Amino acid sequence: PLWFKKVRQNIPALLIISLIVSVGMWLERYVIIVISLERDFLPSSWDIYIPTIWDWSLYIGTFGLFFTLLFLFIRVLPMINIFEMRLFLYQETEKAKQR
C-alpha cells in the first residue's frame, strides 16, 4: 500500500503499517535465529524452542526503560533542534528571493 501516494498521506494508514512492520521485523529475526538453530546437520540433535515468561518480562521491561528515557528527554531537553530550524527558515527565505 505504501507505493500509492494516498496511503502515505493518510496518518492512520501510516501508523497501522508501521506497527505491522515492527512486528514483522521481530518475526524475521525469530525466523533467522531460532528456526535455523532448531534443526541442524544431525537429526538426533533436533529440539523445539519454547519461550518462557521471563524473557517476555525482560522485553516489556526494556520497552519501559526506553520510554522512560524518552519521557525524561522530552521533559528536560528540546525535542526539535532550535538552530538548524531557524537556519532552515533563513535558507528558505533566500531561496524565495532568488525564485
Whole-number minimum distance, CB 55 to other proteins, in Å?
Answer: 13
Q: Give whichever of 34 and 65 is closer to other proteins, judged by the CB atom.
A: 34
- 34 lies in the binding site for other proteins (CB under 8 A): no
Q: Which three cell numbers stand for residue 8?
A: 502515505
Q: Which three cell numbers stand for residue 53?
A: 515468561
| Position among 11, 23, 42, 77 found at the interface with other proteins (CB under 8 A) | 42
Which residue carries 518462557 as its cell? 52
- 55 lies in the binding site for other proteins (CB under 8 A): no
Amino acid making up residue 99:
R
Q: Is 58 left (phi over 0), alpha (psi -120 to 50) or beta?
A: alpha
Whole-number minimum distance, CB 28 to other proteins, in Å?
Answer: 18
**How many chain residues touch other proteins (CB under 8 A)?**
10
Tell me which H or E stretch contains 32. Answer: none
Residues found near other proteins in the complex (CB under 8 A): 37, 40-48
